Structure 1
């Protein structure tokens, strides 16, 4: 029941290394920190607009 995942390596000069995970305990709280999710959505803070603001257009018209 082992999980294989990808290690944080770095941009190589013009790669994929893996690591292994086995969860030892019966409680998900006991698991490692969720450090590899680089997901984001600034939209809700940077643009909470009802009417979509198109950059090349004037903001007011």
Structure 2
């Protein structure tokens, strides 16, 4: 039971190349590093507010 996934490739002038991975061990610890996952969320640090602040309005009014 192989898994297929897309390789990192840059942009091009105005695509998809796959690679194959199979796990050979019984413990999830033995698996390769998870280097693909670029999700983020600055929210928790950059705006830890209770009341929402609208950018265009004055901060204190």
For 1:16 and 1:50, how far apart are their aligned partners in 2?
A: 43
Q: Does 1:23 align with 2:19?
A: no
Normalising to structure 2: TM-score of the pair? 0.96
Give the length in aligned residue pairs. 61
CA RMSD of aligned residues (A): 0.5
Runs of 5+ consecutive residues of structure 2 not aligned to the other structure = none
Deviations 1:18-55 (A, max 9, x none): 01010010001111111000000000000111001111
The runs of at least 4 consecutive aligned structure 1 residues that moved more than 2 Å come to none
For 2:40 and 2:48, how far apart are their aligned partners in 1?
A: 15
Normalising to structure 1: TM-score of the pair? 0.96
